[PDB]
Amino acid sequence: HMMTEYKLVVVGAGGVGKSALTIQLIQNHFVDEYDPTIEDSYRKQVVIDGETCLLDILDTAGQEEYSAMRDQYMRTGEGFLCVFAINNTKSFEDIHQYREQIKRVKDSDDVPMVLVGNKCDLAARTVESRQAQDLARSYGIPYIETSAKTRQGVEDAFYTLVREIRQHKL
Amino acid sequence: EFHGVMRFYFQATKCIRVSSTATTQDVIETLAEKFRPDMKYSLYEVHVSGERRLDIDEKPLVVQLNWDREGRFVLKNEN
Ligand SMILES: Nc1nc2c(ncn2[C@@H]2O[C@H](COP(=O)(O)OP(=O)(O)NP(=O)(O)O)[C@@H](O)[C@H]2O)c(=O)[nH]1
Ligand SMILES: [Mg+2]
């Protein structure tokens, strides 16, 4: 119908696949090396549910030593892609810490999010699919299993977030 | 030797930890590999007072902390 802009912020622990997911969506390319991110920004225009969406994607730092100005980009963000790795139970538990910080920045319980489980191409799963479903349903957000190595669910994860941002777009 | 974070704009935005010893050539090659593998670019400091190009042996981290200067580093390409 109309042109819309969405500010997506990718959020999660280090080595979880935040950069690899974002680069897959922007460049259709999988990054191999593990380069710890500080704050990376991207812009890409797509069509979601029959409307052109200007997506402004902000890939953020997972390492706490690289995440100084977290409060400022959590203010500017409209939706949050909370990524964990299914082979890393620690990054799954950190999700609640990111969840609460985002609710404190926006100061509301109604913050659009999408829970993302990455590295689904690996067989060494330590987080079952139902564990994340309980956490997602307890938050009231969708859960998407993605693989940045094979592009699985990458488009669905970001597009679902856009649909989650529309629910609170005024 | 110390490290600091620097923001770079290009046409979209990257913040990276840069060494006190990193030259402009190393920074450009780092930014080029971060978005275009198989790696000619130039780095500019931009203020409201004017623009200026950094030399190859120059250290952008030391240039940054030399700034009443809302300067911004920009990566550019002649292509
Ligand atoms: N098998 C597999 N490896 C992945 C996947 N996504 C990322 N990786 C790998 O995991 C490592 C971390 O990737 P990265 O995107 O840097 O994670 P990050 O969340 O951005 N890290 P940081 O928080 O430091 O910026 C890299 O070696 C990358 O190749 C995935 O879906 N599957
Ligand atoms: Mg990264």
Domain spans of chain A, in order of start: 1-170
Please list the alpha-helical segments (H only) found in A3-153.
18-27, 70-76, 89-106, 129-139
Task: Give Cα separations from A146 to A83, A115, A164 (angstroms).
Answer: 9, 10, 17
User: B34, A35: Cβ pair inside 8 Å?
Assistant: yes
Q: CA A53 to CA A2: how far, in whole Å?
A: 9
B34 touches chain A (CB under 8 A): yes
All residues at 6 or more sequence positions from B15 whose CB lies less than 8 Å from its CB, including other chains: A38, A39, A40, B5, B6, B7, B8
CB A83 within 8 A of CB A14: no
Residue A83 backbone class (left: φ over 0; alpha: ψ -120 to 50; beta: rest): beta
Rounded (10°) CA dihedral A155, B30, B14, A122: 30
Q: CA B40 to CA B29: how far, in whole Å?
A: 9
**Closest partner residue to A38 among B12, B16, B35, by Cβ?**
B16
Domain coverage including residue B59: 1-79
Q: CA B15 to CA B7: how far, in whole Å?
A: 4
Give chain B's domain count.
Answer: 1
Q: CA A125 to CA A134: how far, in whole Å?
A: 17
Resolution (A): 2.5
Q: CA A53 to CA A156: how far, in whole Å?
A: 14
Fold of the domain spanning A1-170: Rossmann fold (3.40.50)
- Which residue has 């935005």 as its token pair? B13
Rounded (10°) CA dihedral A158, B31, B13, A93: 50
Choosing from A9, A11, A19 the residue with most ligand 1 atoms within 8 A of its CB, the one to mutate for a pocket test is: A19
User: B17, A66: Cβ pair inside 8 Å?
Assistant: yes
User: B15, A42: Cβ pair inside 8 Å?
Assistant: no
Q: CA B24 to CA A164: how far, in whole Å?
A: 42
Q: CA A142 to CA A133: how far, in whole Å?
A: 8
Q: CA B13 to CA B46: how far, in whole Å?
A: 15
CA A143-A135-A43 angle, 5° bins: 40
Method: X-ray
